Amino acid sequence: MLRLNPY
Amino acid sequence: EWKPDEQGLQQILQLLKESQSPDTTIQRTVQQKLEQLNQYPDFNNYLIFVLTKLKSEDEPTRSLSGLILKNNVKAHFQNFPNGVTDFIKSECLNNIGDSSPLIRATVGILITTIASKGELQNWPDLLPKLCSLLDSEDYNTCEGAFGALQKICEDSAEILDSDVLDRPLNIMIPKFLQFFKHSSPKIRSHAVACVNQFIISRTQALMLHIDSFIENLFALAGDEEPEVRKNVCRALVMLLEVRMDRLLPHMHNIVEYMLQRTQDQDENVALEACEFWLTLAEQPICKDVLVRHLPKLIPVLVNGMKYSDIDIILLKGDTISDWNLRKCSAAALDVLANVYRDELLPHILPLLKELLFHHEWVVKESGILVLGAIAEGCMQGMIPYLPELIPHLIQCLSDKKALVRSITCWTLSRYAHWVVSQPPDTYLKPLMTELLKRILDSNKRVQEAACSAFATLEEEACTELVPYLAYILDTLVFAFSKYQHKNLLILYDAIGTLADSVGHHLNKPEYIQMLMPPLIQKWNMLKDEDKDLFPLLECLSSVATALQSGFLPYCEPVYQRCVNLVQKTLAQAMLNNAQPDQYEAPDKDFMIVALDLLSGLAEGLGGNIEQLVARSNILTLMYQCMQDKMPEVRQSSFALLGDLTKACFQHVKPCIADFMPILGTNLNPEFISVCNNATWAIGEISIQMGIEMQPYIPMVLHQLVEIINRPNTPKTLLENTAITIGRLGYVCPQEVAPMLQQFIRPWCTSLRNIRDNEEKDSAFRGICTMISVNPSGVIQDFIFFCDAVASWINPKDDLRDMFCKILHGFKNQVGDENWRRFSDQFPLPLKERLAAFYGV
C-alpha cells in the first residue's frame, strides 16, 4: 500500500 | 520429594519484597540479583514452592513468585533440568483449580507457558489430564482446565491438527461440544472458543460433527453474555467461509441474528458481528439471500461508520487501531456496492442527503466516507448527482475540522475519472487548485490524504496536467521541507506519477532546476538497506524516462547507485544459495527496478551513457542476471541489453559471444515478457553486428520460426518475432533465405497492422534481400506480401524501389492475363495503391 485508505 | 532451606528461602522472600518496592531506583538493583539466580538451576524450584506450598505469605507475593518463574521459562527453558520441570508441572496441575482467583491465574499462565516454549510432545500427559479435569465436580478445577485448554488451542493449532500428538483432536473436539450446555457462562464461552480454532483448518474431528456444532450454536443464540455472543459470532463467520452448504437452509435466521449483533451495545461483539457482512458479500449466493435484508442492513453499516467519541480524541494531536467497527462497516459497504451496483442507491441516497449537509462535523464526515465507499460500484448511478456533490466536496476541502478535510480528499479521488471527462474549467481546475492547497496543510493526516488523492488524480488527468505543470511542481518541491516520515514517501509517488502523466512536457530548464536538486540530495543522504530508497528509485526511474536528455547532468550518481544495488543483490543471492540458514535471502525487487532504471538511462541519454558503461561492470552483472531463475529478472536484463546495443555497442560487442547462447535458450513462449524482450534483443544486436552475425543465427533461427507459427500467440510477441526475423535476413540472408516459405504467412499478417517506423523499415529491408536470394518461397503466398507492401504509406525511396522490383519481377514472370485475375481478389484500396504507387 502506497496510498492511504480510510478502510 | 523436595524440601527448601529456610535461610535461603528468607532472602527469596526479601527479593520478592524488594520487587514490590514503590521506588523505581530499588527495582533495578533486585533484578540484577534475580538475573544471577535465574541462570542458577534449582532456584526455580524455590519459586514454585512459594507460589503453591508456602501459604503463609501474601497473595501478591506468592503470585509474583510464580510469574518470575514464568519469565525464566520464556528464556532459560532450553537449559531447564528434567528433575526440576517434573516437579513444577506436577505442582501446577495440583493447584490448577486454586480457590484464590489470583493464584489460579498465575498457575494457569505457568501451565500454558511450559506448553508454549517447551513443545507439547515433551509433555504428553498434559492433554488427557486436562480433559479429565473438565469433568471434575469442583467448579474452579473445571474453569482452570478450560482456561488452560483454550490458550493451548490458540497457541498451537497446527500442532494439535497433526500426527505429532497422535491426533488428540479426535477426543477433545467431541468433548468440547458437550460443554456448550454448561451452567456457567465462562465455561460455555471457553468451549466455543476452543472449537473455533479448528473451523478454518477443516479439522476432521469437527467437520464430521458439523451438525452437532451448528445445532449447539443456535442453542446459544439468545445468550445474554457478551463474551458468549462474541464467540458465537466468530463461529458463524468462520463457518460461512468453509461450510456454506450447512448454513444455507438456516441463512435467513442467521442474517436476522447477525443484524441484531452488529447493533450490539459492546463494540467488541458488534465488530465480530460486522465481519459477517464482509465475508458474506464475497460469496456467489449473497445477491439473492441478502436482498430481502438490504433495507435494514444499509443504515446499520452507515451508522457504524461514524467516528466514536473515543476515536476523535486519539486522532486529534498510527494512534488508532488498525481495524475497528468503522473500517469494517465501510469495507462491507464497499463490496456490497460492487455486488448490487445501482440497486443499492435507493437505500443510500436519502441517507447521504442528510449526512452530507449535516451541521455536526462527525455526522457530516461519515456521509463523505459513505459517498466514497460506494463510488466504485454505484458509479454509473451517482452520475446525475455528481454536478451537485463534487462542487460541495471541493468546498469541504477548506472545512474547519481536519478530519473532514482529509476524508474529502479521498472521496474526491474516488470520482476522479468523472471529473476528467467533464470540461476542465468546471470541476478539474478548482479541484486541482484546492488539492495543491491541502498538500501544504498544517495537519499531517490531511497532507497524506491530499498528496495521495492528487496522485490518483494524476493517473486520470494525464496530459490535462500540462497547463498546471508550473503550479504543481512549485507545490510538490516546497513539500520537501515540510514532509517527513510517512508523508515523504507519498510525495515521491506524486512526483513519479506526474512524470508518467506529462511525459516529455516535463523536460524544461526551469522545471529541472526545481525538481532535480532536491531529488539528488535525497538520493545521496539515504543509506542502503533503507525503506525510503525504493519509492525514490521508482520515482527517478519515471523522471529519467520523462526528462530524457534533461537527465544528463544528474545521471552519474544515479547510474552508480543502480549498478551497486544489482551487484549487492547478486552477492546476497550467492550467500543464500550456499548457506541459506546463516545468510538472509535478497530482495529481487530492488534489482529489477534498478535494471529498469538503467534501461531507462540507456534509452533516454543514448550515446552519452557510453563513458559510464565502460567504467563499470554493468555487462558482467547483466550476464549474471540473465541466468537468474526469476522471470522478471531475466526480462529486465534483456531489455537493458537491447538498449545498450543501440546506445554503445562498442562496449557490448565483446560480450556477444556469451550473451547469444543465453538469448537462444530464453526464447521460450511460456514466459511472454521474457521471450519478447529476448526476441527484440537479438534483433537489435543483429543490426549492430552485421555479417558477423552468421555463427549465432542457426541456434536462434529455428526458435523464432517456431514461435511465429504457434497459435494463440499475443499480438506484440508476433510483431517482435517478425521484426527480428527480418532483421536477421537483412545482414545475413543466406542462412535465413531457405526458411522464407515457412514464415512468409504470419510475417506479413502481423507486420501489416503496425505503423511505418524504423523497426518496420529494417524488417522489410530484410524481406527484400531474402526475396532477392530465394524468390521461390514468396510465390506461393504472394497475396500476403502485396497486402504487407501496401500497408506502407510513406516508405523510403530506396525501399520503394525494392518493392517495385519484386512486384514488376513477378508481373513480368506470370504475364499480364495472370496478373489481373490474381488482383481481382484484392480489396479496393489494395489494388489501387499498388497500381499507382508502384505502377504495377
3-class DSSP string for B775-786: CHHHHHCHHHHH
For cell 458509479, what's the residue? B379
Q: Which of B706, B769, B684, B762 is nearest to B733 (CA)?
A: B769
Q: How far apart are CA B356 and CA B347, in angstroms?
A: 15
Residue in B407, B493, B535 closest to A6 by CB: B407
C-beta atoms of A4 and B327 within 8 A: no
Q: How far apart are CA B779 and CA B740, in angstroms?
A: 11
C-beta atoms of A2 and B493 within 8 A: yes
Q: How far apart are CA B485 and CA B505, in angstroms?
A: 30
Q: Which of B644, B701, B637 is nearest to B674 (CA)?
A: B637
Number of CB atoms found within 10 A of residue B21's CB: 12
CA distances from B835 to B123, B166, B751, B753, B775 (A): 94, 87, 21, 21, 22
Do residues B479 and B440 make contact, with C-beta atoms less than 8 angstroms apart?
yes
Number of CB atoms found within 10 A of residue B500's CB: 16
Query: B-chain residues within 8 Å CB-CB of A1?
Result: none
Query: B-chain residues within 8 Å CB-CB of A3?
Result: 452, 455-456, 490, 493
Q: How far apart are CA B354 and CA B491, in angstroms?
A: 35
For cell 516508405, what's the residue? B795
Cβ of A4 under 8 Å from any chain B Cβ?
yes
Q: How far apart are CA B368 and CA B549, in angstroms?
A: 45
Q: In angstroms, what separates the C-alpha of A1 from chain B's closest C-alpha?
A: 10
Q: In angstroms, what separates the C-alpha of B407 from chain A's closest C-alpha?
A: 7
C-beta atoms of B330 and A7 within 8 A: yes
Q: Rounded to an integer, what is the distance from CA B229 to the centroid of its chain?
A: 34
Query: B-chain residues within 8 Å CB-CB of A2?
Result: 489-490, 493, 535
Q: How far apart are CA B526 and CA B563, in angstroms?
A: 16
| Cell numbers standing for residue B273 | 458481528
Cβ of A6 under 8 Å from any chain B Cβ?
yes
Q: How far apart are CA B592 and CA B572, in angstroms?
A: 15
Query: A-chain residues within 8 Å CB-CB of B410?
Result: 4-6
Do residues B378 and B342 make contact, with C-beta atoms less than 8 angstroms apart?
yes
Do residues B240 and B279 make contact, with C-beta atoms less than 8 angstroms apart?
yes
| Cell numbers standing for residue B820 | 489481373
CA distances from B509 to B229, B506, B513 (A): 66, 9, 6
For an interface test with A, give the residue of B326, B369, B410 to mutate (most A CBs within 10 A): B410
CA distances from A6 to B269, B300, B366, B437, B458 (A): 22, 18, 11, 21, 20
C-beta atoms of A7 and B334 within 8 A: yes
Q: What single string gives the DSSP state of each residue in B43-92?
A: SHHHHHIIIII--SS-HHHHHHHHHHHHHHHHHHTTS--HHHHHHHHHHH
Q: How far apart are CA B262 and CA B282, in angstroms?
A: 18
Chain A CA closest to residue B455: A3
Q: How far apart are CA B225 and CA B147, in angstroms?
A: 17
User: Three-state DSSP class for B807?
Assistant: helix
User: Three-state DSSP class for B319?
Assistant: coil
All residues at 6 or more sequence positions from B470 whose CB lies less than 8 Å from its CB, including other chains: none
Q: Which of B393, B307, B413, B394 is nearest to B352 (CA)?
A: B393
Do residues B554 and B517 make contact, with C-beta atoms less than 8 angstroms apart?
no
Residue in A2, A4, A7 closest to B327 by CB: A7
Chain B CA closest to residue A2: B490
C-beta atoms of A6 and B456 within 8 A: no
- Kindly tell me the burial class for residue B245, based on how many C-beta atoms sit within 10 Å of its own C-beta (0-12, 13-18, 19 or more): exposed
Angle at B504 between CA B501 and CA B505, to 5 degrees: 75
Q: What technique determined this structure?
A: X-ray
C-beta atoms of B456 and A3 within 8 A: yes
Angle between the N-to-C axes of helices B758-773 and B740-750, in degrees from 0 to 180, rounded to the nearest 10: 150
Cβ of A1 under 8 Å from any chain B Cβ?
no
- Helices vs strands, H then E, count in chain B: 50, 0
Number of CB atoms found within 10 A of residue B655's CB: 15
The residues spanned by each domain of chain B are: 1-840
Do residues B434 and B397 make contact, with C-beta atoms less than 8 angstroms apart?
yes
Do residues B88 and B69 make contact, with C-beta atoms less than 8 angstroms apart?
yes
Cβ of A3 under 8 Å from any chain B Cβ?
yes
Chain A CA closest to residue B321: A7
Question: H or E stretch including B448?
Answer: helix B444-461
C-beta atoms of A6 and B493 within 8 A: no
C-beta atoms of B490 and A3 within 8 A: yes
Do residues B809 and B775 make contact, with C-beta atoms less than 8 angstroms apart?
yes
This structure's resolution (angstroms)? Answer: 3.0
Number of CB atoms found within 10 A of residue B198's CB: 22
Query: A-chain residues within 8 Å CB-CB of B535?
Result: 2
- Kindly tell me the burial class for residue B363, based on how many C-beta atoms sit within 10 Å of its own C-beta (0-12, 13-18, 19 or more): middle
Residue in A3, A5, A6 closest to B493 by CB: A3
Q: How far apart are CA B785 and CA B798, in angstroms?
A: 18
For cell 447493533, what's the residue? B263
| Cell numbers standing for residue B186 | 465462562
C-beta atoms of A2 and B489 within 8 A: yes
Q: Which of B244, B142, B219 is nearest to B186 (CA)?
A: B142
Angle between the N-to-C axes of helices B386-396 and B428-439, in degrees from 0 to 180, rounded to the nearest 10: 20
HSE-CB for B92 with a 13 A CA cutoff: 31
Q: In angstroms, what separates the C-alpha of B264 from chain A's closest C-alpha?
A: 21
Chains A and B: how many Cβ contacts under 8 Å?
25
What CATH class is the domain B1-840?
mainly alpha
Number of CB atoms found within 10 A of residue B318's CB: 9
Residue in A3, A5, A7 closest to B455 by CB: A3
